[PDB]
Write a protein that binds this ligand. Structure first.
Ligand SMILES: CCOc1ccccc1O
Ligand SMILES: CCOc1ccccc1O
Length: 162
């Protein structure tokens, strides 16, 4: 298991435009196109991302290319964030993957709400962190995914991903 396999499980793979759990146009492996309710606006973003007129469909290779970019961007974003970087650097590699997963799903804006969890994670108070993480809109709206990510933070193992 690694961050690519983990996110592939959590995000799935779809080669045509679809709406994610929040109702936003998405393609591939969790590649958010736009929060606009306009399908045309999403098709434009897709074409811009792929570099051709796609008509709302992409190949597996293209999906994977966007995915690699998205993962890279998530990590690079963490490292450029003065609040996230020190916590990220304090973690082992397994727990780092849990961190990347969260940023991938909700963005740096989304994880901004997690100040108290971040502190407990930097303190390595894993069970406390786990309890605090579940007290969230995130957990309530995507409980099964959140439980997997939380177990990963709690244990520093890949047990939740078999
Ligand atoms: C991972 C998303 O997969 C789908 C979404 C909407 C319709 C069919 C899908 O397989
Ligand atoms: C609760 C979110 O956890 C993290 C996110 C980004 C970097 C390090 C983290 O512990």
């Amino acid at each position: 298991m690694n961050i690519f396999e983990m996110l592939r499980i959590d995000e799935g793979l779809r080669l045509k435009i679809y709406k994610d759990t929040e109702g936003y146009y998405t393609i591939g492996i969790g590649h958010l196109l736009t929060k606009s309710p306009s399908l045309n606006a999403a098709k434009s973003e897709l074409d811009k991302a792929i570099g051709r007129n796609t008509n709302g469909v992409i190949t597996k290779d293209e999906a994977e290319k966007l995915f690699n970019q998205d993962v890279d961007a998530a990590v690079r974003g963490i490292l450029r964030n003065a609040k996230l970087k020190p916590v990220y650097d304090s973690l082992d590699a397994v727990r780092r993957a849990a961190a990347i997963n969260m940023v991938f799903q909700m963005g740096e804006t989304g994880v901004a709400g997690f100040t108290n969890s971040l502190r407990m994670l930097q303190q390595k108070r894993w069970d406390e962190a786990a309890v605090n993480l579940a007290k969230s809109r995130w957990y309530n709206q995507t409980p099964n995914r959140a439980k997997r990510v939380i177990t990963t933070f709690r244990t520093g193992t890949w047990d939740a991903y078999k």
